[PDB]
Structure formats: structure tokens, C-alpha cells
């Protein structure tokens, strides 16, 4: 593996940008074939089957993806703080799901309910309709620039959309379309 | 029967046990305070009912129907606390309908409304909510009594059902009669009191209703807490029992995997 | 360190009875609130 | 194994009926030896140690035994409906074990308690005393006709015996012996 | 393992005794490495850190260590009864310590308050100073014969020394120095 991989590089005479697809047998990331491949990469995206069964596409695992340029001195401070703030609340969501199993949903404190409500809305907003999947979903694709991506999550973290249902954040592009979807949902009710 | 399934199933119960274990102490801490405040309210509750005790009053055979009140909370995981009350609530109505009355049932506590909704949906007069989260107070009994009189329904008889705290490991279900009807109150035995009037008796019955309601609530809360503590103890005992067999199964499978994977290497080395 | 150590979210990863029981309750509880939120949105927008 | 098994058949000159006993090493059904014999059979009967621990004899697993002639057009409609109903009731009770083992019986609603009681009553009635075991069990052998079994299971499924204790359906023959043993055990 | 361990025995001229340290891989007591060793052992000694937290030295767990010559036919009758009683009292004290953390100290009956004090004294009579650490702590070492140990524990179990304070039994040798040290205090 090492002999072949070392030839795909950007030397001082030119540049090569490579994208490689890797298969994991039986969803086991400790298998010797994918295990000895993490060392040869600069950015990884891990797809998961649990997320796909909820209906969220693309099924990217948000707590198991990494990059090398995720540094405050390369992408700025605002972009860095937003991502770390998202990951922290997504990690905190998991611990609350053990309590709900034994004692019901309504016995939780109000702060826990607010945390869960914000986390569920954050989870939906990460999905997006693609352009090559118009046959499957039946919608037209979307593209989102970077500034809208930062601002939409910063606003949801602030708490400016606590008066909207979850369904308005599902399969949309920018943040401006969720309220326009909620207004139509209200009109059709 | 693979190693992954055993590992996941072990890791779930390991968390369930700790959740139950942490939930036991909170019920003990609440039970301490619930027991502390019962003694001052017991003398008040007994003192409210002395007059009816001394001068016996018996209701006649009328047809103004009853007013059955059942007390409970909005939380589960307390053994058979609610089922015992809901058992007698439906028992009394059969005898009441044998004579024939327009009886109605009022329940404070959501579980009581939920259990008996299917078969007694029409008899429901009014129900309350937000009970058990915080300790009860006299103002809640005042609110319930105030909202009970404004109803156009009128009754000649009534009863209230509750659980009475007896010991840290036992309790008894009981009910007490209500003679709040003015007409039945005015009987021969009341002639000894010689400064009475209709207005005075109306106010007196009004106050006795709130007194009985407050006494019943302060009796029921302690029994509910003392039952939840025992339930949360038994659940952790069962979880500790399960996590002991799963470990032995895990160890046996772990050894078997190593032996099976070594045999293949030896066999593929010998055939060269 | 040698034994089996659990983590966070292990109850919903095994997919037993408790995981589905946990999922349905959240689904119901958050299915209930959207009606109130939509009704208040319609009333607010009609008022102004 | 295929060379030996293919000779025990029924042809256009006669008939042969085979009854074979098979062994499973270390209580494992995925072992290569007993896992290739399933394809050479027309009827299967699987025995379990856990059932034998509870005292039910014969220890036949009711959710793991099959036959090739269980269809409405051979055994009739009524027999098939009764068998499918009892199997559905048995399957439903198995899915509540985790909750009962920890939280307890009080958390169930009324219908779940009713299904638990009916399944526990049905489990007892499947046991039976054998004649060849009378010497070391102190009982008497029994032999039931088919119609009585069908009717006895129909009656239990209909709820006609919900007022009897569950211990009266243990080690008896026809259904009439359950009411008499319950009457004595007042 | 057999060829080595069979050379440590007691012949007519003398004897050899061995003390060995054990490490259990993966906390599995059925692993082939420690399971083969346990067939040759005649005793165990468990050292814990919780005992060391209280300030007990040597930190030997009394309820977790075991022997094999602990039988009336070998060590005698009086020794066995005394060593049984100490284990009984120390076992019940640990169970009642759970009650005192939930219901409170007032739920204890009259006998419980006496058993607690006797257990608390016994848990401190088990410590002892060593000679090899003489210079560091400035205390003489003590070497108690077996008879004084039996008598000292028997007299505490009777209830005779039920008026001296707890700290008289801490870091002492035979029983006399405890009453002398209690005399010096107060």
C-alpha cells in the first residue's frame, strides 16, 4: 500500500488533488484494510448506517470526521468557534437519551428540554438535497456559500428560532427558506 | 451470539443500573421531608372531624347521587399505588347504580383520569393537573374546593378515597364519608347546639370540605414516596443479577475466538 | 482498565426494547408541540 | 451424508417411514454436523434445555418446529387457524421479557397483563404424562385424540377459563381434567 | 508447572515454604494461566487500598483472604470458634452500615449500637507496628505469640473491655498495653 500511495503527491512542479472512495467490510473500522489507510490522508469523511435510517442524507457522521486545516489561524476564530459549539451540544445530546429511557420525557427539567429542542433542530439543518438525486427525492438541488453556512448555525445556536417547528429545517438550502416553508405550512393548516 | 452483540448488550445494562441507583437517593431525601411535615397536619385533620364523630349523622335513602373523589399524582414507577384506588372507584359505582343515582366521579391526578377513562368517560365532571412535582399546600385544597362548589351539580352524599401511610413498608386504602348536605345535617342530635342558623351551617360545611381535602393530600404524598424508593431498589438488584451472567458469557467467547483464529494460520502453514 | 467500560449513548446503540421505547416517546412529545406553534404562527400573521 | 440419506425414501413399489434421533454438540445448532441434516427432513422437532429446567415435559420448543403439511388444504381450516393463533400469542409474550425482568409487572397496561396470563396458561397445557415414564414419576399415562386437543385450545383462546388458577393446566390430558383438579384445589 | 512445584514439600529432615505473587490477565479467573496455578495453592493474602485509606497497617483484607487448614480437626476447637465469631460480627457491621446512610442513625435499635462499637474496636485491634520501620516512626516492634492473640480477641468478643475508649487499641501489641495506654489517656 505504501509503495503506491507515495506517488500521489503535489511536488514543486505541479499539483494533484485526489479523491478516493474506500469500502469498509461489514461496517467494521478496525479491519486491517481500512485501519492502515487513515495515515495516508489529510481529510476524512465517515458515512454511517444509523444516520441513514433516520432519513438524513448525506449520512455523514458529525462526530467522526476530521481535517488538518481546522485551526484558528487558518480559518479564523468565528468559523472555528461555531463548529466547536455545534459539536459540544451534539455530544451533550447523547447523554440525555439514557435518562429518557427509564423516566419519561416529561419529567425532565426545562433546561434539558430546551437543550434537546435545539439539538434536534441542529441535526435536521445538516441535510441537503443534491442535484444528481432528483430521481430519488424529487426536488431540485441547492448550493450554499460559506457565509450563509456560518450564519445559519450561529443564529440557531443563539436562539432566534425557538418558535418554529422542526419540519421547517428539513431538506432546505440557506436559512432564508425555512421560514418561507413554515409560512406555507401555516397557510395550509 | 457473536462478540459484538454481547458487548453492546452488556454496555446497555451497565448504564441502566447506575441510573436506577442514582434515582434511589432522591426518593429517600424527599421521603424524609415528607415524613417531617405529616405530624403537624395530622392533629389538624383529626380536629376537623371531631364534630361529626361525636354526634352521629346518617344519610337517608335519597337520589341526589354521590361525589367520589380520588387522589393520586402524575408520576409512575410507584408499584401498585394508583391501581388500588382505581380498583375501589369502579367497585363503588356498581352498588350505587344498583339503587340508581346520577353519580359523577372527580379525580385529582392525571393517572386516575387515564386509567378509568375507557369505561367511565361520561361520569367525569372535572379533573385537575400539576400534582406531585412539588409538595402540596393548603392553597391547592382551597382552589379545588372553590372550583368544586361552582359546578351546577348538586349532591346529597359523597366520599373521598386515598392511601393512608402506615409504615415505611406498608400502607392501607380507605375512604371517609361526607355529610356536607345541609338538610341531612339538620337532625335530632343537633338540637343540643342552641346558637345555630342556616347561614352558619352553610359556612361550616364549606370549611369542612377544604379541611378534609387537605388532610387527604398530605396523607397520600408520603406513601407515594415510600413506595417509589422500594421499587428503585429492586430494579437495581435485578440489573446487578443480569450483568453477572453476561460477563462469563463474554469471557468464554473471547477465548474461543483466539483459538479459532490460531488454528487457521497453523493449517495454512502446514499445507505448503 | 482490563474490563469492559461503557460510554454515552450505549442504550440506543444496542437496539433492544428500551431503544425503541425511548424513540417513540420523543416522537410523540415533539409531535404534540408543532400544532400549537403553527396555530400561534397563523394567529400572529393574521393579526398583523 | 447425501449418499447414505438418499436411499431411505418412498418409491412406486413401497413405503418407508423414518424416525431418527440427532445429537447437537455443546448445545449448538450451528455446528456443521447437525446444520446439514435440516435439508433431508420433512418434519422437525427441536428440544431445549431451558424448557426442561422449568419442568415442562416433553421439552419441545414451540417456536422452532416445522412440518411440510401445515396448510389449509390438507389439515383443514379450523386446525390451521387454531395453530396460527396459539403461535402468535406465544410470540407476543416473548417480546416483553426485558421490561418485566427489570421494571416489573406493574408497568404494563391491562391488555398486556391479559396476554401474559393467557400465554402462561397456554404454556402449561402443552405438557403431558407418558406411559413409559410411570415407573419413576408416580403418574398414569394419557393419550389424547385430535379433536379434543383442537377444542381445548379453542376454548382457552376464547377466554372461557380466565377464572381458573394457572396451576390447574399442568400434567393433565383432556381439558375436562383441568376443571376437576381446579375444583379439588379450591 | 508440576515438575517445579512438587519439589517444595516437607520431608523428614526439614521443609520449604513458598510465597508467590499472582497476576490475572484481563481480570478473567478462568484463564488457563491462573487456573492451573490455583490447583497448588493452600492460602491467599489480599492487600487493598481502601484499608490503607483508613490508616490500617498492614493493609490485609480480613473478609477477602482465605486459608485451607482452617478446620476443627487440625487447628483445634477454641481457635476455630474465635475466628468464626470475629468474621460474623465484622460481616454484619458492613450490612448495617448501609442502613445508616439512608434511614438515618436513629433507626438503630439498642443492640445495633453495641455491635457497632464492638466492631469498631475490633477493626483497630488488628493493626501492629513492625521492626523494619523502627527508625522512621520511632516505635518498637512487637512479636505476639499465638496464645496471646487468641486470648486477646476472645476477651474483646466476650464484652469485658467495653468501657475503655477506641484509641487504646490502636497500634499496640498484646492486650495489656491497650489498658495501659487507656490509663495514660485522660
Provide the 3-class DSSP secondary structure of residue D61: coil
- Distance (Å, rounded) from C-alpha A73 to C-alpha B90? 72
Q: What is the DSSP string of A137-168?
A: H-S------HHHHHHHHHHHHHTTTTTS-GGG
Q: Are A167 and C9 an interchain contact pair (Cβ–Cβ within 8 Å)?
A: no
A99, A101, A107 ranked by CB distance to B75: nearest: A107
Q: Are B240 and B10 in contact, with CB atoms under 8 Å apart?
A: no
Distance from CA of A169 to the nearest CA of B (A): 32
Residue ranges of A 120-159 with Cβ closer than 8 A to chain C: 120
**Structure solved via:** cryo-EM
Closest residue in C to D98 (Cα–Cα): C17
| H or E, element range at B18 | helix B3-36
- Distance (Å, rounded) from C-alpha B184 to C-alpha B197? 14
Kindly state the cell numbers that stand for B40.
403537624
B19, B75, B77 ranked by CB distance to A99: nearest: B19
Distance from CA of B35 to the nearest CA of D (A): 25
Q: Are C16 and B247 an interchain contact pair (Cβ–Cβ within 8 Å)?
A: no
Q: Are B17 and B239 in contact, with CB atoms under 8 Å apart?
A: yes
Burial (0-12, 13-18, 19+ Cβ within 10 Å), B108 = buried
Residue B89's nearest CA partner among B119, B62, B60 is: B119
Q: Are A122 and C34 in contact, with CB atoms under 8 Å apart?
A: no
Provide the 3-class DSSP secondary structure of residue D14: strand
| Straight-line distance from the first to the last Cα atom of chain A, in angstroms, rounded to the nearest whole number | 59
Interface with chain B: mutation pick from C7, C9, C14, highest number of B CBs within 10 Å: C14
Burial (0-12, 13-18, 19+ Cβ within 10 Å), A152 = buried
Interface with chain A: mutation pick from C16, C35, C37, highest number of A CBs within 10 Å: C37
Flag whether residue A100 sits within 8 Å of chain C, measured between CB atoms: yes
- Distance (Å, rounded) from C-alpha B38 to C-alpha B239? 34
Q: Are A86 and A157 in contact, with CB atoms under 8 Å apart?
A: yes
Q: Are A16 and A10 in contact, with CB atoms under 8 Å apart?
A: yes
Residue ranges of B 14-33 with Cβ closer than 8 A to chain A: 15-16, 19-20, 23
Q: Are B12 and C16 an interchain contact pair (Cβ–Cβ within 8 Å)?
A: yes
- Distance (Å, rounded) from C-alpha B82 to C-alpha B105? 16
The number of angstroms, rounded, from the C-alpha of B201 to the middle of its chain's C-alpha atoms is 33
Residue D100's nearest CA partner among D91, D112, D88 is: D112
SS (H, E, C) E15-42: ECCCCCCCCCHHHCCCCHHHHHHCCCCC
- The answer to whether chain A touches chain E by having 3 or more C-beta pairs less than 8 angstroms apart is no
Whole-Å CA distances, B154 to B146, B177, B254, D147: 14, 16, 73, 60
Distance from CA of D107 to the nearest CA of C (A): 13
Residue B217's nearest CA partner among B27, B21, B37, B17 is: B37
| CB proximity list for B117: less than 8 A, separation 6 or greater | B124
- Distance (Å, rounded) from C-alpha E136 to C-alpha B171? 62
**Residues from E in contact with B at Cβ < 8 Å:** 26, 28, 30-31, 102-104
Burial (0-12, 13-18, 19+ Cβ within 10 Å), B256 = exposed
Provide the 3-class DSSP secondary structure of residue A100: helix
Instruction: Please list every residue in chain A whose beta carbon sits closer than 8 Å to the beta carbon of residue C21.
Output: 101
CA dihedral E85, E89, E91, E93 (to 10 degrees): 180
Q: What is the DSSP string of D122-181?
A: HHHHT----STTGGGT--------HHHHHHHHHHHHTTTTTTS-GGGGSS-SSTHHHHHH
The number of angstroms, rounded, from the C-alpha of D150 to the middle of its chain's C-alpha atoms is 13
Instruction: Please list every residue in chain D whose beta carbon sits closer than 8 Å to the beta carbon of residue C14.
Output: none
Q: What is the DSSP string of B188-247?
A: GGGGG--S--HHHHHHHHHHHHHHHHHHHHHHHHHHHHHHHHHHHHHHHHHHHHHHHHHH
| CB proximity list for D33: less than 8 A, separation 6 or greater | D25
- Distance (Å, rounded) from C-alpha B98 to C-alpha B92? 10
Q: Are D145 and D175 in contact, with CB atoms under 8 Å apart?
A: no
| H or E, element range at A28 | none
Residue B148 phi/psi, 5-degree rounding, is -80, -35
Count of CB atoms within 10 A of residue D178's CB?
A: 23
Q: Are B163 and B172 in contact, with CB atoms under 8 Å apart?
A: yes
Q: Are A103 and B23 an interchain contact pair (Cβ–Cβ within 8 Å)?
A: yes
Half-sphere exposure of D64 (CA within 13 A, CB side): 10
Q: Are E30 and B251 an interchain contact pair (Cβ–Cβ within 8 Å)?
A: yes
CA angle B84, B88, B93 (to 5 degrees): 155
- Distance (Å, rounded) from C-alpha B129 to C-alpha B74? 8
Flag whether residue E29 sits within 8 Å of chain C, measured between CB atoms: no
Distance from CA of A93 to the nearest CA of C (A): 9
β-strands A66-67, A43-44 pairing: antiparallel
Tell me the structure's resolution in angstroms, rounded to a single decimal.
Answer: 3.0
- Distance (Å, rounded) from C-alpha D83 to C-alpha D153? 9
β-partners of residue B203 are none
- Distance (Å, rounded) from C-alpha D160 to C-alpha B116? 25
Distance from CA of D26 to the nearest CA of B (A): 13
Q: Are B34 and A114 in contact, with CB atoms under 8 Å apart?
A: no
Amino acid at each position: 500500500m505504501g509503495t503506491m500511495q507515495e506517488r500521489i503527491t503535489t511536488t514543486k512542479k505541479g499539483s494533484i488533488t485526489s479523491v478516493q472512495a474506500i469500502y469498509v467490510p461489514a461496517d467494521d473500522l478496525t479491519d486491517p484494510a481500512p485501519a492502515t489507510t487513515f495515515a495516508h490522508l489529510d481529510a476524512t469523511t465517515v458515512l454511517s448506517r444509523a444516520i441513514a435510517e433516520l432519513g438524513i442524507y448525506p449520512a455523514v457522521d458529525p462526530l467522526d470526521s476530521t481535517s488538518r486545516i481546522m485551526d484558528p489561524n487558518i480559518v479564523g476564530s468565528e468559523h472555528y468557534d461555531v463548529a466547536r459549539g455545534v459539536q459540544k451540544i451534539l455530544q451533550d445530546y447523547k447523554s440525555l437519551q439514557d435518562i429518557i429511557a427509564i423516566l419519561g420525557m416529561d419529567e425532565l427539567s426545562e433546561e434539558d428540554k430546551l437543550t434537546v429542542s435545539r439539538a434536534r433542530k441542529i441535526q435536521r439543518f445538516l441535510s441537503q438535497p443534491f442535484q444528481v438525486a432528483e430521481v430519488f427525492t424529487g426536488h431540485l438541488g441547492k448550493l450554499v456559500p460559506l457565509k450563509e453556512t456560518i450564519k445559519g448555525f450561529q443564529q440557531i445556536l443563539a436562539g432566534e428560532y425557538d418558535h418554529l417547528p422542526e419540519q421547517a429545517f428539513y431538506m432546505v438550502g440557506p436559512i432564508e427558506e425555512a421560514v418561507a416553508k413554515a409560512d406555507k405550512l401555516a397557510e395550509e393548516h | 451470539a457473536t462478540l459484538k452483540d454481547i458487548t453492546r448488550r452488556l454496555k446497555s445494562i451497565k448504564n441502566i443500573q447506575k441510573i436506577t441507583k442514582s434515582m434511589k437517593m432522591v426518593a429517600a431525601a424527599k421521603y424524609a421531608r415528607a415524613e417531617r411535615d405529616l405530624k403537624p397536619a395530622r392533629v389538624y385533620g383529626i380536629g376537623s372531624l371531631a364534630l361529626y364523630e361525636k354526634a352521629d349523622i346518617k344519610v337517608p335513602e335519597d337520589k341526589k347521587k354521590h361525589l367520589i373523589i380520588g387522589v393520586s399524582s402524575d408520576r409512575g414507577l410507584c408499584g401498585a399505588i394508583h391501581s388500588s384506588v382505581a380498583k375501589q372507584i369502579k367497585s363503588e359505582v356498581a352498588n350505587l347504580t344498583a339503587a340508581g343515582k346520577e353519580v359523577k366521579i372527580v379525580g385529582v391526578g392525571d393517572k386516575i383520569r387515564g386509567i378509568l377513562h375507557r369505561t367511565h368517560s361520561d361520569q367525569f365532571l372535572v379533573t385537575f393537573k400539576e400534582v406531585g412535582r412539588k409538595p402540596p399546600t393548603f392553597g391547592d385544597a382551597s382552589v379545588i374546593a372553590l372550583e368544586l362548589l361552582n359546578s351546577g351539580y348538586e349532591f346529597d352524599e359523597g366520599s373521598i378515597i386515598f392511601n393512608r401511610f402506615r409504615s415505611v413498608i406498608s400502607y392501607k386504602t380507605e375512604e371517609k364519608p361526607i355529610f356536607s348536605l345541609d338538610t341531612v345535617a339538620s337532625a335530632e342530635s343537633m338540637s343540643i347546639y342552641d346558637d345555630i342558623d342556616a347561614d352558619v351551617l352553610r359556612n361550616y360545611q364549606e370549611y369542612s370540605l377544604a379541611n378534609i381535602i387537605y388532610y387527604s393530600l398530605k396523607e397520600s404524598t408520603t406513601s407515594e414516596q415510600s413506595a417509589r424508593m422500594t421499587a428503585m431498589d429492586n430494579a437495581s438488584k435485578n440489573a446487578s443479577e443480569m450483568i453477572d451472567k453476561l460477563t462469563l458469557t463474554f469471557n468464554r467467547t473471547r477465548q474461543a475466538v483466539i483459538t479459532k483464529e490460531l488454528i487457521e494460520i497453523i493449517s495454512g502453514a502446514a499445507a505448503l | 482498565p482490563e474490563g469492559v467500560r461503557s460510554g454515552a449513548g450505549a442504550v440506543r446503540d444496542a437496539g433492544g426494547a428500551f431503544g425503541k421505547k425511548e424513540q417513540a416517546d420523543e416522537e410523540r412529545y415533539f409531535r404534540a408541540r408543532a400544532r400549537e406553534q403553527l396555530a400561534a404562527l397563523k394567529k400572529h400573521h393574521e393579526n398583523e
